[PDB]
Design a protein around this ligand. Structure first.
Ligand SMILES: [Mg+2]
Ligand SMILES: [Mg+2]
Ligand SMILES: [Mg+2]
Ligand SMILES: [Mg+2]
Ligand SMILES: [Mg+2]
Ligand SMILES: [Mg+2]
Ligand SMILES: [Mg+2]
Ligand SMILES: [Mg+2]
Ligand SMILES: [Mg+2]
Ligand SMILES: [Mg+2]
Ligand SMILES: [Mg+2]
Ligand SMILES: [Mg+2]
Ligand SMILES: [Mg+2]
Ligand SMILES: [Mg+2]
Ligand SMILES: [Mg+2]
Ligand SMILES: [Mg+2]
Ligand SMILES: [Mg+2]
Ligand SMILES: [Mg+2]
Ligand SMILES: [Mg+2]
Ligand SMILES: [Mg+2]
Ligand SMILES: [Mg+2]
Ligand SMILES: [Mg+2]
Ligand SMILES: [Mg+2]
Ligand SMILES: [Mg+2]
Ligand SMILES: [Mg+2]
Ligand SMILES: [Mg+2]
Ligand SMILES: [Mg+2]
Ligand SMILES: [Mg+2]
Ligand SMILES: [Mg+2]
Ligand SMILES: [Mg+2]
Ligand SMILES: [Mg+2]
Ligand SMILES: [Mg+2]
Ligand SMILES: [Mg+2]
Ligand SMILES: [Mg+2]
Ligand SMILES: [Mg+2]
Ligand SMILES: [Mg+2]
Ligand SMILES: [Mg+2]
Ligand SMILES: [Mg+2]
Ligand SMILES: [Mg+2]
Ligand SMILES: [Mg+2]
Ligand SMILES: [Mg+2]
Ligand SMILES: [Mg+2]
Ligand SMILES: [Mg+2]
Ligand SMILES: [Mg+2]
Ligand SMILES: [Mg+2]
Ligand SMILES: [Mg+2]
Ligand SMILES: [Mg+2]
Ligand SMILES: [Mg+2]
Ligand SMILES: [Mg+2]
Ligand SMILES: [Mg+2]
Ligand SMILES: [Mg+2]
Ligand SMILES: [Mg+2]
Ligand SMILES: [Mg+2]
Ligand SMILES: [Mg+2]
Ligand SMILES: [Mg+2]
Ligand SMILES: [Mg+2]
Ligand SMILES: [Mg+2]
Ligand SMILES: [Mg+2]
Ligand SMILES: [Mg+2]
Ligand SMILES: [Mg+2]
Ligand SMILES: [Mg+2]
Ligand SMILES: [Mg+2]
Ligand SMILES: [Mg+2]
Ligand SMILES: [Mg+2]
Ligand SMILES: [Mg+2]
Ligand SMILES: [Mg+2]
Ligand SMILES: [Mg+2]
Ligand SMILES: [Mg+2]
Ligand SMILES: [Mg+2]
Ligand SMILES: [Mg+2]
Ligand SMILES: [Mg+2]
Ligand SMILES: [Mg+2]
Ligand SMILES: [Mg+2]
Ligand SMILES: [Mg+2]
Ligand SMILES: [Mg+2]
Ligand SMILES: [Mg+2]
Ligand SMILES: [Mg+2]
Ligand SMILES: [Mg+2]
Ligand SMILES: [Mg+2]
Ligand SMILES: [Mg+2]
Ligand SMILES: [Mg+2]
Ligand SMILES: [Mg+2]
Ligand SMILES: [Mg+2]
Ligand SMILES: [Mg+2]
Ligand SMILES: [Mg+2]
Ligand SMILES: [Mg+2]
Ligand SMILES: [Mg+2]
Ligand SMILES: [Mg+2]
Ligand SMILES: [Mg+2]
Ligand SMILES: [Mg+2]
Ligand SMILES: [Mg+2]
Ligand SMILES: [Mg+2]
Ligand SMILES: [Mg+2]
Ligand SMILES: [Mg+2]
Ligand SMILES: [Mg+2]
Ligand SMILES: [Mg+2]
Ligand SMILES: [Mg+2]
Ligand SMILES: [Mg+2]
Ligand SMILES: [Mg+2]
Ligand SMILES: [Mg+2]
Ligand SMILES: [Mg+2]
Ligand SMILES: [Mg+2]
Lengths: 119, 56, 123, 65
RNA sequence: GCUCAACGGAUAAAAGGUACUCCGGGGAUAACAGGCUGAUACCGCCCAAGAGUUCAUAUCGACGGCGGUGUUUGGCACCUCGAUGUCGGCUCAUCACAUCCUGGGGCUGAAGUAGGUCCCAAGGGUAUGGCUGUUCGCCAUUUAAAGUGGUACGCGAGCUGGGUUUAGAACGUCGUGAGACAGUUCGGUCCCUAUCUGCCGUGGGCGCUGGAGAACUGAGGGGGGCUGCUCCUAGUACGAGAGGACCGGAGUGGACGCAUCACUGGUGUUCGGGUUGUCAUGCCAAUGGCACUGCCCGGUAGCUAAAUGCGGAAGAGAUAAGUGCUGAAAGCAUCUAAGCACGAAACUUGCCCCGAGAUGAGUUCUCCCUGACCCUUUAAGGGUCCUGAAGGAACGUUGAAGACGACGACGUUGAUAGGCCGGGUGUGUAAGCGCAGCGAUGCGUUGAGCUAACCGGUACUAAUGAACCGUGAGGCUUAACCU
RNA sequence: AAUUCCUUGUCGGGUAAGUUCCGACCUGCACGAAUGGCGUAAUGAUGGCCAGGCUGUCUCCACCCGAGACUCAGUGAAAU
RNA sequence: ACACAGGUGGUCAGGUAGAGAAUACCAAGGCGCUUGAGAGAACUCGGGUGAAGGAACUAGGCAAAAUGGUGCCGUAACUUC
RNA sequence: GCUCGCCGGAAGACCAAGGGUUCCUGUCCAACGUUAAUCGGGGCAGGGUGAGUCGACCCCUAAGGCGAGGCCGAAAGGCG
RNA sequence: AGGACCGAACCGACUAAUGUUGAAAAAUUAGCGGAUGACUUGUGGCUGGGGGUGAAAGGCCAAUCAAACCGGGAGAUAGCU
């Protein structure tokens, strides 16, 4: 029973979910809209949006923290150069979930996770 | 671990009483593009609640 | 939380070092012993000359446990070793005359008044 | 009680073994030789009579000598 | 001219082993279990010689007699040899009363304490270990007690495989030998995805007579029902003492159950740190990957037990054995025949839970719909147009709810989830820089940084304008009324 | 006694308690001398027994992580 | 019998740590094992940790746990030395 | 294409055995592929294997086989 | 020096769990014994059914062994189903 628990498992062990959500947060930052399943998109909000709150303070420390979350210098140089002052005034909710139907290969509920200030 | 008699086509059809599919109840019409989609989903041409949420 | 087959240390000069709990007295089906609970023990290791001899079967009272005792405020007094003070089977009063180490407030009664009146530290 | 050894199922279900416990003395016997307890009871009562008359004639030959 | 005697003579002439086995067959025929029976067994009962200081019946009861149970060992061979798979343990049980404990009694050769034996009573309870494959048994220490039995000697399509009961081997013994042994000893494959009944949960469908939302009564069903120790009454009753109570009251325990996470803890691969090896980030620094979470150290929420709260009861009604009262039949006696009173953990209530599919489908409160037409075969008839209520459902955000369904909260008139903000908590003084040190490092910045699920806030994101379903005043017969 | 029916022999030790074990006894059902007797250091995935450490084997189970189960989409067996 | 957790002889042998062709992470090089997506019940399988006790379990310490490396000190009965 | 993970005395490279066109290219998706497939070791069409030195053949013999004559055996044949 | 010790490849299979219409008509996983020898392995050759071969279990002799396999006698016979 998962009374008051939080976090999805996604049929993946711990060292894969931390790696996959790193490869996925580092792709939502780069292209600003990606396409994924709906259970994977409601759990990427819990990863990406603390990386933009981490981007609202351009310190040497937060550069070194956000490189521990992404391990990509191009992402950290987009989080703090571009996405930092873009969401400098939004109180959370930096992203948006858009359900886009069902996938042909396995009938999965797909979705578009995008950034808010994109278009 | 196995049957002892052949179950009839009556007992077989009674088990399939609940296998019937539930058809979609509401297909919301988009207010700008005028095309039908699923309620709370985007359309097939990238609209959702009027605005163009994603290009093609 | 003393049960059967439990090696206990000894808290008096009765003449044993190491005893083993062979029954928890005080009721049918009874699993465990707190402190101030009468257990039957046998002597697994004794000094070469003392009041009790190796292999004797006699009662005891538990004075210290590692699971401890909870006071009514919620506080608990945990020790680092299980101890007991040997008794006689019939009279059920302590054998040794000089209690080693501390005991607790749960041991004093009209029954074990002698043991808390011989121990150094009554927590 | 059931006998204990080889011989198979017929051993395994039928009891055919009789232990007799003499109350005022305490001599017991456990004869288990046959497959029927009736040949195993009288040939166990034959042994206690041979182990009580062998226990007073042994007692009347300690306090005799 | 044959004891061809196995005497209607298989040939003049003929022994064994198989656990290495094989085939044809049989429940025509054994081992297991069922059945029939009840010799035996177990339990009652009848007579009472005696034992019991005397006194058959306080307690045992010879010699014999009559039954019960199916319960031991059997008997018979009816069921199964085109398979009914097996002892013991484990795990679940479940019923019986011929009661081990607790409860109520009668008698006692019952002073008291404590026993004895019988009667009523099945409600709950009815140990852990040593030995042995053990059932059984003995033993240790307990306990209020460590009951007797039924259920394929309960339970292998639930588990175990020690014993037996295959193939290997050896000993003793028997055989000339193959081999043999209810003789031991070492080793030795236990298969099956549940159709049906069953059971535990939980839904869908319609019904309940217009529809819908709620709150209900309770026909019934289930759970629950254990008990010690100390103290007071009182060292009083009782007793030569020794010893030591009834009745009643109080505490505090054991086992069990229900609940919960505040407490002490457990876990906490989603939190923080220490660390080894190696690889990588251009290198130093810092980090990260992988090595069971690399190995550890702590630990939030949650879940949990060892944690701490509560529980059994009291009462009432009717009773069983029992004790009576009045009281005849039967001028007396008599508990009963009339009449009446007490009398148990049993029975019915009382206590919690389920419960109107209780089709005998109940009750109460609230809400909602007051259109036109035709058609023929006038009927609880069929069609068309208009209409679409209360409400529900879907979808979405979801939950201390959940396998799925269901249930619950929420959908912008919005705190429903994520985020964000503040705190809490956990780890224990982050990085960068500065200094001290030859350097490892230490100190300062600094109880710092980081911080999951928690708590309090905040519309930042996602919860859409809708649409779909469900409709249009609800049958007939009596009756009470109503003007 | 890898052998003893009676047999859990008896006595001692070990254990609170030991049908196993080890030491004696000899009443050897039915040991016994190359179908070898009695010893025997080393060796054994060898049989039996005890002690120490260690521990979810257990008292008494909890929690956690993954793979199934479970729902959805696709394909689609079997004994009977 | 299959695009099958099996089996199939020989040759080449890089880095760091290590005695090593153990083993961990790597290079050259090659792969992600040809249904997925959710959910985070029972139960099973493979693992992690555990308060107090520590063989009470059991046929039996089965299984797990634990011990584990190098250098040095030290080491008993018995013995065929 | 960018990340991530895995093996690395192998899940790498190359022989022999064995297989026998699976190689490569264009094309196609009915079947085959445990799903789908534009993909394939699948269908259809075309292409591809170049040796004085490598391997075989060749020369040499081992076990062992055949065996002129020969010895033996009813025949077949056996031994040499 | 060694039918010597520890231990990978290599050969084997001691316990346990899984698996038992399996991934597999005997395997997987973690431990396990030998590992310079009475070792292992390749390629070829030989021994043939009452015969072979056997460090001996009636073992192995192409998933078959108290007497293989295939063809025939052969439509054996069957008081049995
Ligand atoms: Mg939550
Ligand atoms: Mg799955
Ligand atoms: Mg890891
Ligand atoms: Mg049938
Ligand atoms: Mg169905
Ligand atoms: Mg036999
Ligand atoms: Mg029988
Ligand atoms: Mg004849
Ligand atoms: Mg005749
Ligand atoms: Mg044999
Ligand atoms: Mg047969
Ligand atoms: Mg018959
Ligand atoms: Mg029978
Ligand atoms: Mg009868
Ligand atoms: Mg009789
Ligand atoms: Mg009298
Ligand atoms: Mg009588
Ligand atoms: Mg009589
Ligand atoms: Mg019967
Ligand atoms: Mg019978
Ligand atoms: Mg039958
Ligand atoms: Mg049969
Ligand atoms: Mg049948
Ligand atoms: Mg009765
Ligand atoms: Mg009485
Ligand atoms: Mg009962
Ligand atoms: Mg016991
Ligand atoms: Mg035992
Ligand atoms: Mg029973
Ligand atoms: Mg019976
Ligand atoms: Mg049975
Ligand atoms: Mg059974
Ligand atoms: Mg066995
Ligand atoms: Mg044999
Ligand atoms: Mg329903
Ligand atoms: Mg009831
Ligand atoms: Mg708590
Ligand atoms: Mg809390
Ligand atoms: Mg804690
Ligand atoms: Mg906690
Ligand atoms: Mg590292
Ligand atoms: Mg560095
Ligand atoms: Mg890597
Ligand atoms: Mg901890
Ligand atoms: Mg009452
Ligand atoms: Mg009454
Ligand atoms: Mg009466
Ligand atoms: Mg009267
Ligand atoms: Mg009268
Ligand atoms: Mg009670
Ligand atoms: Mg009642
Ligand atoms: Mg507000
Ligand atoms: Mg929120
Ligand atoms: Mg703090
Ligand atoms: Mg400081
Ligand atoms: Mg750090
Ligand atoms: Mg610092
Ligand atoms: Mg803090
Ligand atoms: Mg925070
Ligand atoms: Mg909040
Ligand atoms: Mg002895
Ligand atoms: Mg001896
Ligand atoms: Mg002998
Ligand atoms: Mg001999
Ligand atoms: Mg001789
Ligand atoms: Mg001889
Ligand atoms: Mg010999
Ligand atoms: Mg050997
Ligand atoms: Mg033992
Ligand atoms: Mg495949
Ligand atoms: Mg290397
Ligand atoms: Mg390796
Ligand atoms: Mg799980
Ligand atoms: Mg932990
Ligand atoms: Mg563990
Ligand atoms: Mg523990
Ligand atoms: Mg501990
Ligand atoms: Mg034991
Ligand atoms: Mg036991
Ligand atoms: Mg082991
Ligand atoms: Mg281990
Ligand atoms: Mg690697
Ligand atoms: Mg390869
Ligand atoms: Mg081809
Ligand atoms: Mg190709
Ligand atoms: Mg091609
Ligand atoms: Mg197609
Ligand atoms: Mg296909
Ligand atoms: Mg092709
Ligand atoms: Mg050449
Ligand atoms: Mg030659
Ligand atoms: Mg010739
Ligand atoms: Mg020749
Ligand atoms: Mg060697
Ligand atoms: Mg072999
Ligand atoms: Mg292995
Ligand atoms: Mg070795
Ligand atoms: Mg074979
Ligand atoms: Mg043959
Ligand atoms: Mg033959
Ligand atoms: Mg013929
Ligand atoms: Mg025929």
């Amino acid at each position: 029973m998962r009374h008051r628990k939080s976090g999805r498992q996604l049929n993946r062990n711990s060292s894969h979910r931390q790696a996959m959500f790193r490869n996925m947060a580092g792709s939502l930052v780069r292209h600003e809209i990606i396409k994924t399943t709906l259970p994977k998109a409601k759990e990427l909000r819990r990863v990406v949006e603390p990386l933009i709150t981490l981007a609202k303070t351009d310190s040497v420390a937060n550069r070194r923290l956000a490189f521990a979350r992404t391990r990509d210098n191009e992402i950290v140089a987009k989080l703090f150069n571009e996405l930092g002052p873009r969401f400098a005034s939004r109180a959370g909710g930096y992203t948006r979930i858009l359900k886009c139907g069902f996938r042909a290969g396995d009938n999965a509920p797909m979705a578009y996770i995008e950034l808010v200030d994109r278009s | 671990a196995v049957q002892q008699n052949k179950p009839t086509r009556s007992k077989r059809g009674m088990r399939r009483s609940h296998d019937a599919l539930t058809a979609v109840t509401s297909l919301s019409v988009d207010k700008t593009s005028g095309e039908k989609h699923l309620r709370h989903h985007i359309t097939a041409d990238g609209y959702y609640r009027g605005r163009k949420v994603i290009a093609k | 939380m003393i049960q059967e087959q439990t090696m206990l240390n000894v808290a008096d000069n009765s003449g044993a070092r190491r005893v083993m709990c062979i029954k928890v007295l005080g009721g049918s089906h009874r699993r465990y012993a707190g402190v101030g609970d009468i257990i039957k023990i046998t002597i697994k290791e004794a000094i070469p000359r003392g009041k009790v001899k190796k292999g004797d079967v006699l009662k005891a009272v538990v004075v210290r446990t590692k699971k401890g005792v909870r006071r009514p405020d919620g506080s608990v007094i945990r020790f680092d070793g299980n101890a007991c003070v040997l008794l006689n089977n019939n009279s059920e009063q302590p054998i040794g005359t000089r209690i080693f180490g501390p005991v607790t407030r749960e041991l004093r009664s009209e029954k074990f008044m002698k043991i808390i009146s011989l121990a150094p530290e009554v927590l | 009680f059931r006998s204990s050894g080889a011989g198979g199922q017929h051993v395994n279900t039928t009891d055919s073994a009789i232990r007799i416990t003499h109350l005022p003395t305490g001599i017991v016997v456990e004869c288990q030789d046959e497959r029927s307890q009736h040949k195993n009871k009288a040939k166990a009562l034959s042994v206690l009579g041979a182990r009580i008359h062998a226990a007073e004639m042994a007692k009347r030959q300690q306090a005799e000598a």
